[PDB]
Design a protein around this ligand. Sequence first.
Ligand SMILES: O=c1[nH]c2ccc(S(=O)(=O)c3ccccc3)cc2c(=O)n1O
Ligand SMILES: [Mn+2]
Ligand SMILES: [Mn+2]
Length: 136
Amino acid sequence: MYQLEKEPIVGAETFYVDGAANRETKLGKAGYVTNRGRQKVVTLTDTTNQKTELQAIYLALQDSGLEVNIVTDSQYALGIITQWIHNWKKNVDLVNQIIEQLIKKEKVYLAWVPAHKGIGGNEQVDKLVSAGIRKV
Ligand SMILES: O=c1[nH]c2ccc(S(=O)(=O)c3ccccc3)cc2c(=O)n1O
Ligand SMILES: [Mn+2]
Ligand SMILES: [Mn+2]
């Protein structure tokens, strides 16, 4: 990939990603739902909210084709990726794994939306990852 796309990629699968963690137990979940009806959730241990957001993006990169749209509610995760591309043109291992996957893509669009603002795909993945982690 040459850059993050300036707008969504026509014809590419869209992954709504999210993570949830609990500070008392360090238990969490990460996952995605896609516009093509795919979904995945994984359970995590010794994790944090920010780590789960990175894990969700890693899953989306791993499971997507060469062109992908990713919608996250994490400014932290968005910033990690934007900063790396910049320097190219905390959570060190996870970040390296994400960059490893990112560089294999042909095109990537990555957009931020606010959490808990009624945004469809984002609310769907939030329900999936927060169950058993965050109290309703
Ligand atoms: O990235 C984030 N940031 C959040 C910030 C606040 C809340 S909250 O629990 O305080 C909340 C819940 C419901 C409505 C408003 C705020 C939840 C989240 C969340 O689930 N994800 O994924
Ligand atoms: Mn989130
Ligand atoms: Mn959430």
